[PDB]
Each structure stands twice: as C-alpha cells, then as structure tokens.
Design a protein around this ligand. Sequence first.
Ligand SMILES: CSc1ncncc1CC(=O)N1CCC[C@H](C(N)=O)C1
Ligand SMILES: [Zn+2]
Length: 139
Amino acid sequence: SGAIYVGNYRVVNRHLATHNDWANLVWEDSSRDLLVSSTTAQGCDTIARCDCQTGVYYCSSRRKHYPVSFSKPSLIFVEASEYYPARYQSHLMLAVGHSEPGDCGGILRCQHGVVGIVSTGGNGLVGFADVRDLLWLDE
Ligand SMILES: CSc1ncncc1CC(=O)N1CCC[C@H](C(N)=O)C1
Ligand SMILES: [Zn+2]
C-alpha cells in the first residue's frame, strides 16, 4: 500500500484505489495502473522532473529502503493477475530488487523528488509506475 500526496491530489495504484478515490476521481489509466483523486488538505510530496535512472525505493515487505538502477519508462508485458488481464503496461520502469504482493504503493525517489510508485514485481525484479510526465500534478 502507499500513495503520493502532492498539492490537492493523491496518486495511488489504480488496482488499490478505494471507494473514496473513485468518488473524488481526477484521472485514471488502467494501462499505467495509476489513479489520481482530489484531496481537501495540502500534500506533503514534490515530483521529480528529470531523466534519472537511479534512486531509492521503500520496500514495505522488508521495512527498508533500497537503492536501484531502473530502466526508462516503457511498454512492458505483465502477466494476468486477480486485478488485470494479461496486457502491456505503459510508462513502467524495471529494476533488480525485492518486491512481493503488498509492496505496491512504495515510493521511488531520486535527488529531485518523487519518481513513481511500486506497481509490479517478481523473482528479484520490481517495477515502478512513472509519474514524472504528469506535469499537471504541480499546478
Ligand atoms: C510488487 S507487486 C508483485 N511483486 C512480486 N510478485 C508479484 C507481484 C504482483 C504483481 O506484479 N501484480 C499484481 C497486482 C497488479 C500488478 C499490475 N500492475 O498489473 C501486477
Ligand atoms: Zn532525478
């Protein structure tokens, strides 16, 4: 679990969005596993606007942060799960690192701010949904 809180927006994994997220929907994209909802309180986070390919992510299944080298955002095949059919997920970045079900929502940060959130994983890989192209989160 986990979310990004920026300005009057909350960014979550679309597959983990609550009834309240859907009732306050701003934008969602099943191909990216992202959903953004509106909030009344001002957020705590800032978003990176960069091309970093290294950073640090929070891994809730280890209660620890780990450094990662990750690929540029791209279209990646993701196997069927209870949440989605087998499909290509867009704007996804892969890295070698631990992840297990329950870790989605962990934040990836570089020196510039928030890069994205954990969205996929398996067998020593971890995949992050990029948010750096969503320029409207800042205004
Ligand atoms: C950190 S998630 C994880 N980690 C390790 N092993 C399995 C997983 C589970 C996983 O990859 N998915 C299930 C939930 C929907 C995800 C999606 N974005 O389509 C795909
Ligand atoms: Zn950066």
